Design a protein around this ligand. Structure first.
Ligand SMILES: CCCc1sc(-c2ccc(OC)c(OCCNS(C)(=O)=O)c2)nc1CSc1nc(N)cc(N)n1
Ligand SMILES: CCCc1sc(-c2ccc(OC)c(OCCNS(C)(=O)=O)c2)nc1CSc1nc(N)cc(N)n1
Ligand SMILES: O=c1ccn([C@@H]2O[C@H](COP(=O)(O)OP(=O)(O)O)[C@@H](O)[C@H]2O)c(=O)[nH]1
Ligand SMILES: O=c1ccn([C@@H]2O[C@H](COP(=O)(O)OP(=O)(O)O)[C@@H](O)[C@H]2O)c(=O)[nH]1
Lengths: 230, 230
């Protein structure tokens, strides 16, 4: 009976900011952080610690490997929040920091289109992704999507505006791709998929364009109004 | 209810011929051929030819991707049989051409030791393999193993007989290490895997150096006798 809601958005757009806020507003709300973030000392970390630097260091060698690991690690954290967090809340909501579809339809896709993965690497990844995401068939299935919307430029601010040694090289151009991949997926809804419920899940667009850090109340109101609809 | 037996042995031990021979003998007797062996000869088959072909040219680049895809293809292909085949035979037995256990502890373990997977790939694969098998491959658990123990030169000769222009190389030295790792897991029973039960799991081991595609009644008498103590 748990609602599962993915919060989408570009690098350093504020997804984690938002989910950190939402978690403390209700004791019936919990957050699943995205693993690549914790990567960015268990065996998942060193590995993702390793695979992330290796990806940065050379993407067209390491993208498949990185992509497959990011997603399995996501599929395992989300399974372990639903089966752990929140036992009998009246109104339980689980907020996911991104989803298995951002893994593929935004990130995996982009690397394929950036020629950082070949057709065999991309078809294999999809095969792996699609046969598996048809195994769980309604467990991880989303109830709603919330899209934090920044400009690649708002996002670019915040990437520097944000502290991680390794991230300092991310150039503007990486972002406009993901943005159009984001805008085209979650608004214009051109981008099609092989998950026969995703073209009917509803979406909440949210201008994180104005700083919303000590002025988060009306965003949170839209979220509450949205939840009531679902 | 459906009994699962793994057929294990070095490349060209004679697994595909023994298993083809066995399946003719009984309507209770069914088979799951190895995905890899099928690729040598459908998008999976489109993917499978290419990465195998890639894995010959540059094992050091392609072993993670090959080992992940080989194992994924076996699981799903063992599941399809398990979910459908033998629903009611009276005494159903499915013979697997190799297993997720050889995927990992012969071929991947060897690929890494010989430095075609670096350390991180091998740890990721091992993590992938634990979770992929626990979530999806559970009901594939083995009732026993038929280890078709042979020797190196036999196989080279048999590779030649088959005429497979890709393998006709394979260093007698590479046939010689794959050969050595099967003893440890199966012959001496030393290798403790990550899956505890196998330690108990009954193993039959047959010497098959001699041409058998005419004479195997003794090979089959020991199967039948093995299967009944199960
Ligand atoms: C934000 C830290 C993760 C990284 S690192 C990275 C990267 C690093 C170096 C790259 O090339 C030099 C690269 O892309 C190749 C070309 N793009 S570029 C930098 O404009 O020339 C991507 N992409 C990414 C995003 S891939 C990703 N996949 C997921 N499945 C989830 C997720 N959160 N992120
Ligand atoms: C028989 C077709 C599959 C191949 S191709 C292959 C290969 C091909 C070319 C190679 O070098 C040019 C090669 O070398 C591997 C490393 N060389 S070495 C002597 O160990 O240092 C391996 N190994 C293999 C076996 S790995 C494997 N894993 C599975 N899980 C299943 C399966 N059938 N095979
Ligand atoms: O309204 C906002 C949104 C984001 N940020 C900053 O932007 C950076 C990146 O945010 P986050 O890591 O939460 O973004 P995500 O990558 O999760 O979209 C962080 O330093 C945040 O403090 C901010 O100061 N105010
Ligand atoms: O007793 C035998 C078993 C096999 N073969 C031949 O050796 C080759 C390799 O055998 P197989 O495909 O069974 O090996 P595996 O499937 O174990 O790789 C094939 O062309 C077989 O016809 C043979 O001549 N005598």
């Amino acid at each position: 009976r748990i609602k599962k809601i993915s919060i989408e958005g570009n690098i350093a757009a504020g997804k984690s900011t938002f989910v950190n806020i939402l978690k403390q507003l209700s004791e019936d709300w919990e957050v699943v952080p995205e693993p690549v973030a914790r990567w960015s000392l268990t065996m998942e970390q060193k590995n993702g610690g390793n695979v992330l630097q290796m990806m940065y260091e050379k993407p067209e060698r390491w993208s498949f490997t990185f992509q497959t690991y990011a997603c399995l690690s996501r599929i395992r954290a989300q399974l372990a929040s639903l089966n752990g967090k929140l036992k009998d809340a009246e109104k339980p909501v689980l907020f996911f920091e991104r989803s298995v579809y951002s893994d593929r339809y935004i990130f995996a896709s982009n690397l394929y289109e950036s020629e950082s993965m070949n057709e065999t690497e991309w078809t294999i990844y999809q095969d792996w992704h699609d046969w598996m995401n048809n195994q769980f068939g309604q467990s991880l299935e989303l109830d709603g999507i919330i899209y934090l919307q920044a400009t690649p430029e708002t996002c670019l601010h915040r990437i520097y505006l944000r502290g991680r040694n390794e991230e300092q090289g991310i150039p503007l151009e990486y972002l406009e791709k993901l943005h159009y991949k984001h805008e085209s997926w979650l608004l214009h809804r051109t981008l099609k998929t092989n998950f026969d419920y995703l073209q009917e899940v509803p979406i909440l667009t949210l201008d994180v364009n104005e700083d919303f850090k000590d002025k988060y109340e009306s965003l949170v109101e839209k979220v509450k109004e949205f939840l009531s609809t679902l």
